[PDB]
From a paper:
N has two domains, the amino-terminal domain (NTD) and the carboxy-terminal domain (CTD), with a positively charged cleft in between that is suitable for RNA binding. Here, the Newcastle disease virus (NDV), a member of the genus Avulavirus, family Paramyxoviridae, which is relatively safe for handling, was selected as the model to look at how NDV RNP protects its viral genome and to provide new insights into the development of [name]-based antivirus therapies.
Different from the reported ring-structure and helical spirals, a novel clam-shaped structure of NDV N with two single-turn spirals packing in a back-to-back manner was identified and determined, corresponding to the extracted [name] assembly of NDV. Further 3D refinement resolved the clam-shaped structure to 6.4 Å resolution and showed obvious C2 symmetry in the rigid body. Homolog modeling on NDV N, based on the 40% sequence identity of N between NDV and Parainfluenza virus 5 (PIV5), resulted the subunit N model and the model was flexibly docked into the EM density map. Distance analysis of the residues in the loop suggested that hydrogen bonds may exist between two pairs of Glysin119 and Arginine117 residues. The evidence suggests that Loop114–120 has no influence on helical assembly but has a crucial role in clam-shaped structure formation. The double-headed spiral uses a self-capping mechanism that involves the clam-shaped core to protect the RNA genome’s integrity. The C-tail is located inside the clam-shaped structure, and is only accessible from either end by P or other proteins in order to form the N–RNA–RdRp complex for the replication and transcription of the genomic RNA; this finding differs from those of previous reports that have described outside-orientated C-tails.
Author numbering: 1 to 18, 26 to 398
The structure:
Amino acid sequence: MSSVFDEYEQLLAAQTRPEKGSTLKVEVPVFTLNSDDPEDRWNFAVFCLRIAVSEDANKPLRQGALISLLCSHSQVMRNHVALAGKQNEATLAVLEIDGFTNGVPQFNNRSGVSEERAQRFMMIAGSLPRACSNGTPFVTAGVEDDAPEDITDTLERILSIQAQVWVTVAKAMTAYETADESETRRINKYMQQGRVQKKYILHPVCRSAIQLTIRQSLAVRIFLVSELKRGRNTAGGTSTYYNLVGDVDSYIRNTGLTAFFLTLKYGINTKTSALALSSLSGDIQKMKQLMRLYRMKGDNAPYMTLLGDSDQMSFAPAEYAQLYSFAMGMASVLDKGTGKYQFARDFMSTSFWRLGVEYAQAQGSSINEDMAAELKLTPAARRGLAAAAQR
RNA sequence: UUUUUU
Protein backbone atom coordinates (compact mmCIF):
# COMPACT_ATOMS: atom_id res chain seq x y z
CA MET A 1 0.00 0.00 0.00
CA SER A 2 1.81 3.05 -1.33
CA SER A 3 0.58 6.04 0.63
CA VAL A 4 0.62 9.47 -0.94
CA PHE A 5 2.90 11.17 1.58
CA ASP A 6 5.07 8.07 1.78
CA GLU A 7 5.62 8.04 -1.96
CA TYR A 8 6.16 11.78 -1.69
CA GLU A 9 9.16 10.90 0.48
CA GLN A 10 10.19 8.01 -1.79
CA LEU A 11 10.28 10.67 -4.50
CA LEU A 12 12.30 13.05 -2.40
CA ALA A 13 14.94 10.40 -1.54
CA ALA A 14 16.29 9.39 -4.96
CA GLN A 15 17.11 13.05 -5.69
CA THR A 16 19.36 13.65 -2.67
CA ARG A 17 22.05 11.09 -3.56
CA PRO A 18 25.45 12.87 -3.55
CA GLU A 19 37.00 8.77 -11.60
CA LYS A 20 37.07 12.50 -12.12
CA GLY A 21 38.86 13.64 -15.26
CA SER A 22 42.34 15.14 -15.38
CA THR A 23 42.93 18.72 -16.50
CA LEU A 24 45.91 20.98 -16.96
CA LYS A 25 47.68 21.37 -13.61
CA VAL A 26 50.54 23.71 -12.65
CA GLU A 27 53.60 22.78 -10.62
CA VAL A 28 53.78 24.19 -7.07
CA PRO A 29 57.28 24.83 -5.69
CA VAL A 30 57.43 23.74 -2.07
CA PHE A 31 60.24 24.07 0.39
CA THR A 32 61.65 21.39 2.59
CA LEU A 33 63.83 21.81 5.63
CA ASN A 34 66.49 19.29 6.58
CA SER A 35 68.42 20.67 9.51
CA ASP A 36 68.53 20.48 13.29
CA ASP A 37 69.92 23.94 14.02
CA PRO A 38 67.47 26.28 15.82
CA GLU A 39 69.09 29.17 13.96
CA ASP A 40 68.22 27.35 10.73
CA ARG A 41 64.58 26.69 11.51
CA TRP A 42 64.35 30.36 12.56
CA ASN A 43 65.74 31.62 9.26
CA PHE A 44 63.58 29.10 7.42
CA ALA A 45 60.48 30.49 9.10
CA VAL A 46 61.39 34.17 8.63
CA PHE A 47 62.29 33.34 5.04
CA CYS A 48 59.07 31.47 4.24
CA LEU A 49 57.18 34.39 5.79
CA ARG A 50 59.04 37.09 3.81
CA ILE A 51 58.08 35.02 0.78
CA ALA A 52 54.45 34.58 1.79
CA VAL A 53 54.07 38.34 2.19
CA SER A 54 55.61 39.28 -1.15
CA GLU A 55 54.64 42.35 -3.13
CA ASP A 56 55.98 40.94 -6.42
CA ALA A 57 56.31 37.12 -6.44
CA ASN A 58 53.81 35.18 -8.52
CA LYS A 59 51.00 33.13 -6.98
CA PRO A 60 51.92 29.41 -6.91
CA LEU A 61 55.08 30.43 -5.09
CA ARG A 62 53.43 32.37 -2.28
CA GLN A 63 51.18 29.39 -1.98
CA GLY A 64 54.24 27.21 -1.49
CA ALA A 65 55.74 29.61 1.01
CA LEU A 66 52.53 29.24 3.03
CA ILE A 67 52.59 25.47 2.75
CA SER A 68 56.08 25.73 4.21
CA LEU A 69 55.00 28.03 7.05
CA LEU A 70 52.42 25.42 7.86
CA CYS A 71 54.89 22.51 7.48
CA SER A 72 57.88 23.96 9.27
CA HIS A 73 56.43 23.08 12.68
CA SER A 74 57.41 19.41 12.58
CA GLN A 75 60.77 17.76 13.23
CA VAL A 76 60.81 14.83 10.77
CA MET A 77 59.38 16.66 7.75
CA ARG A 78 60.11 13.99 5.13
CA ASN A 79 56.91 12.07 5.86
CA HIS A 80 54.79 15.20 6.22
CA VAL A 81 55.87 16.41 2.77
CA ALA A 82 55.28 12.85 1.53
CA LEU A 83 51.76 13.23 2.97
CA ALA A 84 51.68 16.44 0.95
CA GLY A 85 52.68 14.36 -2.08
CA LYS A 86 49.89 11.89 -1.36
CA GLN A 87 47.24 14.19 -2.84
CA ASN A 88 47.33 13.33 -6.54
CA GLU A 89 45.06 16.15 -7.73
CA ALA A 90 47.63 18.97 -7.64
CA THR A 91 51.42 18.67 -8.21
CA LEU A 92 54.18 19.56 -5.72
CA ALA A 93 58.00 19.44 -5.82
CA VAL A 94 60.62 18.93 -3.12
CA LEU A 95 63.45 21.49 -3.48
CA GLU A 96 65.58 20.26 -0.60
CA ILE A 97 66.85 23.69 0.40
CA ASP A 98 69.82 21.93 2.06
CA GLY A 99 70.11 24.85 4.45
CA PHE A 100 71.60 28.31 4.09
CA THR A 101 74.95 29.49 5.39
CA ASN A 102 75.70 32.11 8.03
CA GLY A 103 74.95 34.86 5.55
CA VAL A 104 71.20 34.96 5.44
CA PRO A 105 70.80 35.06 1.66
CA GLN A 106 72.31 31.93 0.16
CA PHE A 107 69.96 29.13 -0.45
CA ASN A 108 72.49 26.38 -0.69
CA ASN A 109 70.97 23.50 -2.57
CA ARG A 110 72.27 20.31 -4.18
CA SER A 111 69.39 18.99 -6.27
CA GLY A 112 67.10 20.31 -8.97
CA VAL A 113 67.74 24.07 -8.91
CA SER A 114 70.01 26.72 -10.49
CA GLU A 115 71.86 29.86 -9.49
CA GLU A 116 69.74 32.03 -11.75
CA ARG A 117 66.76 30.83 -9.73
CA ALA A 118 69.43 31.52 -7.29
CA GLN A 119 68.84 35.19 -7.86
CA ARG A 120 65.10 35.55 -7.99
CA PHE A 121 63.86 34.74 -4.48
CA MET A 122 66.65 36.60 -2.90
CA MET A 123 65.50 39.01 -5.41
CA ILE A 124 62.06 38.09 -3.98
CA ALA A 125 63.42 38.55 -0.49
CA GLY A 126 63.43 42.19 -1.59
CA SER A 127 59.74 41.76 -2.24
CA LEU A 128 58.28 44.13 0.31
CA PRO A 129 54.93 45.66 1.16
CA ARG A 130 55.44 49.35 0.36
CA ALA A 131 52.35 49.90 2.51
CA CYS A 132 53.83 47.96 5.42
CA SER A 133 56.17 49.80 7.76
CA ASN A 134 59.76 49.13 8.85
CA GLY A 135 59.71 47.04 5.68
CA THR A 136 59.43 43.94 7.87
CA PRO A 137 56.65 41.61 8.96
CA PHE A 138 56.88 41.91 12.71
CA VAL A 139 55.53 45.24 14.06
CA THR A 140 58.07 45.56 16.89
CA ALA A 141 61.18 46.27 14.86
CA GLY A 142 64.11 44.84 16.81
CA VAL A 143 62.64 41.34 17.10
CA GLU A 144 63.85 39.31 14.08
CA ASP A 145 67.57 39.74 14.84
CA ASP A 146 67.01 37.47 17.85
CA ALA A 147 69.03 34.55 19.19
CA PRO A 148 67.23 31.20 19.31
CA GLU A 149 69.58 29.59 21.84
CA ASP A 150 67.34 26.53 22.26
CA ILE A 151 64.81 24.79 20.09
CA THR A 152 61.90 25.47 22.40
CA ASP A 153 61.50 29.22 21.68
CA THR A 154 62.04 28.58 17.97
CA LEU A 155 59.15 26.13 18.09
CA GLU A 156 57.05 28.59 20.09
CA ARG A 157 57.64 31.33 17.51
CA ILE A 158 56.71 28.91 14.72
CA LEU A 159 53.58 28.09 16.72
CA SER A 160 52.67 31.77 17.04
CA ILE A 161 53.11 32.50 13.36
CA GLN A 162 51.21 29.38 12.31
CA ALA A 163 48.45 30.08 14.84
CA GLN A 164 48.11 33.61 13.55
CA VAL A 165 47.53 31.80 10.29
CA TRP A 166 45.16 29.18 11.78
CA VAL A 167 43.02 31.84 13.41
CA THR A 168 42.77 33.69 10.06
CA VAL A 169 41.70 30.59 8.35
CA ALA A 170 38.08 31.19 9.45
CA LYS A 171 35.90 33.72 7.64
CA ALA A 172 37.52 32.27 4.60
CA MET A 173 35.45 34.00 1.89
CA THR A 174 36.85 36.37 -0.75
CA ALA A 175 35.24 39.67 0.09
CA TYR A 176 37.13 41.38 2.88
CA GLU A 177 35.14 39.96 5.77
CA THR A 178 36.17 41.96 8.69
CA ALA A 179 37.10 39.43 11.33
CA ASP A 180 39.97 41.44 12.80
CA GLU A 181 38.17 41.95 16.12
CA SER A 182 37.28 38.28 16.54
CA GLU A 183 40.80 37.35 15.48
CA THR A 184 41.90 39.78 18.21
CA ARG A 185 39.57 38.21 20.80
CA ARG A 186 41.08 34.81 20.06
CA ILE A 187 44.60 36.24 20.15
CA ASN A 188 43.76 37.72 23.54
CA LYS A 189 42.50 34.41 24.90
CA TYR A 190 45.53 32.62 23.45
CA MET A 191 47.37 35.19 25.53
CA GLN A 192 45.25 33.98 28.45
CA GLN A 193 46.65 30.57 27.52
CA GLY A 194 50.12 31.93 26.83
CA ARG A 195 51.41 29.66 24.08
CA VAL A 196 51.75 32.77 21.86
CA GLN A 197 53.78 35.82 22.85
CA LYS A 198 52.67 39.39 22.39
CA LYS A 199 56.14 40.00 20.94
CA TYR A 200 55.47 38.24 17.62
CA ILE A 201 52.36 39.77 16.10
CA LEU A 202 52.37 40.28 12.36
CA HIS A 203 51.21 43.28 10.35
CA PRO A 204 47.41 42.86 10.06
CA VAL A 205 47.31 44.18 6.47
CA CYS A 206 49.77 41.52 5.26
CA ARG A 207 47.84 38.97 7.32
CA SER A 208 44.52 39.70 5.57
CA ALA A 209 46.38 39.46 2.29
CA ILE A 210 47.66 36.07 3.44
CA GLN A 211 44.00 35.20 3.96
CA LEU A 212 43.04 36.41 0.47
CA THR A 213 45.89 34.23 -0.81
CA ILE A 214 44.67 31.24 1.19
CA ARG A 215 41.24 31.41 -0.48
CA GLN A 216 42.45 32.13 -3.95
CA SER A 217 44.44 28.80 -3.93
CA LEU A 218 42.57 25.53 -4.24
CA ALA A 219 44.83 22.91 -2.77
CA VAL A 220 46.37 24.80 0.13
CA ARG A 221 42.86 24.59 1.64
CA ILE A 222 42.69 20.90 0.79
CA PHE A 223 45.91 20.53 2.75
CA LEU A 224 44.27 22.51 5.56
CA VAL A 225 41.30 20.12 5.44
CA SER A 226 43.55 17.08 5.74
CA GLU A 227 45.56 18.81 8.46
CA LEU A 228 42.31 19.41 10.37
CA LYS A 229 41.06 15.87 9.79
CA ARG A 230 44.23 14.41 11.25
CA GLY A 231 43.82 16.96 14.05
CA ARG A 232 40.28 15.96 14.91
CA ASN A 233 41.36 12.29 14.72
CA THR A 234 44.17 12.51 17.28
CA ALA A 235 43.36 12.38 20.98
CA GLY A 236 44.50 14.72 23.78
CA GLY A 237 47.81 13.23 24.83
CA THR A 238 50.09 14.39 22.01
CA SER A 239 52.29 17.23 20.67
CA THR A 240 51.40 20.91 20.96
CA TYR A 241 50.88 21.63 17.29
CA TYR A 242 47.89 19.30 16.86
CA ASN A 243 46.48 20.65 20.07
CA LEU A 244 46.54 24.19 18.71
CA VAL A 245 44.98 22.96 15.48
CA GLY A 246 42.14 20.95 17.05
CA ASP A 247 41.53 23.69 19.60
CA VAL A 248 41.05 26.29 16.84
CA ASP A 249 39.14 23.71 14.85
CA SER A 250 35.76 24.10 16.51
CA TYR A 251 35.89 27.73 15.40
CA ILE A 252 36.80 26.71 11.85
CA ARG A 253 33.96 24.21 11.32
CA ASN A 254 30.25 24.58 10.60
CA THR A 255 30.75 27.80 8.63
CA GLY A 256 28.32 29.31 6.12
CA LEU A 257 25.70 26.75 7.09
CA THR A 258 24.55 29.26 9.67
CA ALA A 259 20.84 29.84 9.00
CA PHE A 260 20.48 26.06 8.65
CA PHE A 261 21.83 25.62 12.25
CA LEU A 262 19.86 28.52 13.65
CA THR A 263 16.78 26.62 12.46
CA LEU A 264 18.12 23.51 14.18
CA LYS A 265 18.78 25.39 17.41
CA TYR A 266 15.69 27.62 17.74
CA GLY A 267 13.16 26.33 15.23
CA ILE A 268 13.21 22.63 16.06
CA ASN A 269 15.31 21.63 19.08
CA THR A 270 12.86 23.60 21.30
CA LYS A 271 9.75 21.78 19.91
CA THR A 272 7.25 24.53 20.54
CA SER A 273 3.60 23.81 19.70
CA ALA A 274 3.46 26.24 16.79
CA LEU A 275 6.04 24.07 15.20
CA ALA A 276 3.05 21.81 14.87
CA LEU A 277 0.76 23.75 12.63
CA SER A 278 -1.26 23.47 9.47
CA SER A 279 1.66 23.31 7.05
CA LEU A 280 5.07 24.07 8.42
CA SER A 281 5.53 20.29 8.18
CA GLY A 282 6.72 19.95 4.56
CA ASP A 283 9.76 22.05 5.26
CA ILE A 284 10.33 20.00 8.46
CA GLN A 285 10.25 16.90 6.28
CA LYS A 286 12.92 18.49 4.13
CA MET A 287 14.78 19.47 7.35
CA LYS A 288 15.13 15.82 8.33
CA GLN A 289 16.04 15.07 4.71
CA LEU A 290 19.06 17.40 4.97
CA MET A 291 19.70 15.80 8.35
CA ARG A 292 20.02 12.35 6.78
CA LEU A 293 22.16 14.03 4.07
CA TYR A 294 24.31 15.57 6.76
CA ARG A 295 24.91 12.32 8.68
CA MET A 296 25.38 9.98 5.73
CA LYS A 297 27.54 12.71 4.23
CA GLY A 298 29.51 12.82 7.43
CA ASP A 299 33.23 12.68 7.03
CA ASN A 300 33.54 15.88 5.02
CA ALA A 301 30.29 17.27 6.31
CA PRO A 302 31.41 19.92 8.84
CA TYR A 303 33.63 21.27 6.05
CA MET A 304 31.73 21.82 2.83
CA THR A 305 32.40 25.54 2.83
CA LEU A 306 36.11 25.07 2.84
CA LEU A 307 35.66 22.09 0.65
CA GLY A 308 33.80 24.13 -1.95
CA ASP A 309 31.52 21.47 -3.35
CA SER A 310 28.24 22.63 -4.88
CA ASP A 311 26.04 20.31 -2.77
CA GLN A 312 25.70 22.82 0.07
CA MET A 313 23.43 24.52 -2.32
CA SER A 314 21.23 21.63 -1.21
CA PHE A 315 21.64 23.39 2.12
CA ALA A 316 19.75 26.34 0.68
CA PRO A 317 17.98 28.36 3.38
CA ALA A 318 15.55 29.56 0.74
CA GLU A 319 13.25 26.59 0.29
CA TYR A 320 12.66 26.84 4.09
CA ALA A 321 11.72 30.54 3.94
CA GLN A 322 8.60 30.04 6.11
CA LEU A 323 10.22 27.89 8.79
CA TYR A 324 13.50 29.78 8.35
CA SER A 325 11.76 33.07 9.08
CA PHE A 326 9.88 31.77 12.11
CA ALA A 327 13.04 30.25 13.69
CA MET A 328 14.74 33.65 13.12
CA GLY A 329 11.98 35.95 14.39
CA MET A 330 11.93 33.86 17.56
CA ALA A 331 15.73 33.91 17.94
CA SER A 332 15.49 37.66 17.37
CA VAL A 333 13.26 38.02 20.43
CA LEU A 334 14.51 35.16 22.66
CA ASP A 335 18.21 35.53 21.93
CA LYS A 336 20.22 38.69 21.71
CA GLY A 337 22.50 37.76 18.88
CA THR A 338 22.71 38.76 15.22
CA GLY A 339 21.22 42.19 15.96
CA LYS A 340 24.30 44.03 14.63
CA TYR A 341 24.04 42.84 10.98
CA GLN A 342 21.58 42.11 8.13
CA PHE A 343 20.86 38.43 8.46
CA ALA A 344 17.69 38.32 6.36
CA ARG A 345 16.44 37.34 2.90
CA ASP A 346 14.20 38.86 0.26
CA PHE A 347 12.44 35.52 -0.27
CA MET A 348 11.11 35.89 3.31
CA SER A 349 7.49 35.73 4.55
CA THR A 350 6.43 38.62 6.77
CA SER A 351 3.62 37.00 8.74
CA PHE A 352 5.61 34.09 10.16
CA TRP A 353 8.22 36.54 11.36
CA ARG A 354 5.44 38.54 13.03
CA LEU A 355 4.27 35.31 14.57
CA GLY A 356 7.71 34.31 15.81
CA VAL A 357 7.64 37.65 17.61
CA GLU A 358 4.15 37.23 19.01
CA TYR A 359 4.72 33.59 20.03
CA ALA A 360 8.07 34.35 21.65
CA GLN A 361 6.70 37.39 23.47
CA ALA A 362 4.49 35.22 25.75
CA GLN A 363 6.80 32.74 27.46
CA GLY A 364 3.89 31.41 29.43
CA SER A 365 3.52 28.73 26.78
CA SER A 366 6.74 26.62 26.99
CA ILE A 367 5.27 23.38 28.31
CA ASN A 368 7.07 20.13 27.56
CA GLU A 369 5.82 16.58 27.75
CA ASP A 370 9.27 15.60 28.96
CA MET A 371 9.58 17.33 32.32
CA ALA A 372 5.82 16.85 32.82
CA ALA A 373 6.22 13.08 32.73
CA GLU A 374 9.53 13.50 34.61
CA LEU A 375 8.50 15.28 37.79
CA LYS A 376 4.74 14.56 37.86
CA LEU A 377 4.18 18.30 37.68
CA THR A 378 0.99 19.75 39.13
CA PRO A 379 -1.37 22.29 37.60
CA ALA A 380 -0.50 24.47 40.59
CA ALA A 381 3.18 24.48 39.65
CA ARG A 382 2.26 25.11 36.01
CA ARG A 383 0.27 28.25 36.77
CA GLY A 384 2.92 29.25 39.32
CA LEU A 385 5.78 29.21 36.84
CA ALA A 386 3.36 31.00 34.50
CA ALA A 387 2.99 33.84 37.01
CA ALA A 388 6.79 33.87 37.09
CA ALA A 389 6.89 34.34 33.31
CA GLN A 390 4.29 37.09 33.71
CA ARG A 391 7.31 39.23 34.57
C1' U B 1 24.42 31.86 -2.87
C1' U B 2 27.52 33.77 1.24
C1' U B 3 27.31 38.07 6.30
C1' U B 4 26.95 36.35 14.97
C1' U B 5 29.06 34.52 20.09
C1' U B 6 31.94 30.65 21.98
